[PDB]
Amino acid sequence: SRQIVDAQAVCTRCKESADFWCFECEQLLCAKCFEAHQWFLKHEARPLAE
Amino acid sequence: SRQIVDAQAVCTRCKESADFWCFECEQLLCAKCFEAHQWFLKHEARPLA
Ligand SMILES: [Cl-]
Ligand SMILES: [Zn+2]
Ligand SMILES: [Zn+2]
Ligand SMILES: [Zn+2]
Ligand SMILES: [Zn+2]
């Protein structure tokens, strides 16, 4: 399943602009929510292209 | 900006399973492509996990 991520994509948790994609959660995250995700989970994830 | 994301991380070059992200190439690379990357370039990069 590929997915289109719009230019205005937003974090799945808060309202901030998305910066990361998690391959196992399948979700978009802002930097601050992403740092929490990395503390509590060990998932493959990547920065979004700027 | 506008881009496609996949459920699985695969190398941008060869489509094998990916292991690294390069911030300046903005690319996913498998281990073998990334070793080649390091031979030719010096960029900020991280493993995917
Ligand atoms: Cl992707
Ligand atoms: Zn995750
Ligand atoms: Zn967030
Ligand atoms: Zn490759
Ligand atoms: Zn690079």
Numbering used by the authors:
A (entry chain B): 119 to 168
B (entry chain A): 119 to 167
Source paper text:
The ProMyelocyticLeukemia (PML) protein, also known as TRIM19, is the core component of PML nuclear bodies (NBs) that are tightly associated with nuclear matrix. It has been reported that PML NB can play many instrumental roles in DNA-damage responses, apoptosis, cellular senescence, and angiogenesis, etc. Previous studies have shown that the integrity of RBCC domain is essential for PML NB formation. In this study, we also report a previously unrecognized B1-box polymerization (n > 4) that is essential for PML/TRIM19 nuclear body assembly.
In line with the GF/UC analysis above, the structure of B1-box was determined to 2.0 Å resolution, unveiling an unexpected oligomerization in PML. In the B1-box monomer, the residues 120–127 fold into a loop-like subdomain 1 (SD1), which is ~12 Å away from the B1 core. In comparison, the residues 128–167, coordinated by two Zn ions, fold into a compact global domain, termed subdomain 2 (SD2). The subdomain 2 is a typical B-box-type Zn finger fold with a conserved β1–β2–α1–β3 arrangement and Zn-binding residues. The α1 helix and β-sheet are coordinated with two Zn ions, residues C129/C132/C148/C151 (Zn1) and C140/C143/H155/H161 (Zn2). In W157-dimer, the inter-molecular engagement is mainly mediated by two sets of hydrophobic interactions between W157 and F152/F138. In F158-dimer, the bulky hydrophobic side-chains are located in the heart of the dimeric interface, reminiscent of L73–L73 handshake in PML RING dimerization. In SD1-dimer, the N-terminal I122 and V123 residues could undergo a loop-to-strand transition to seal two B1s together via β-strand augmentation. The intermittent engagement between W157- and F158-interfaces enables the formation of a “brick”-like tetramer. In the α1-mediated W-shape coiled-coil, the K160 residues are consistently placed at the bottom of the B1 tetramer, giving rise to a highly concentrated Lys patch/lining.
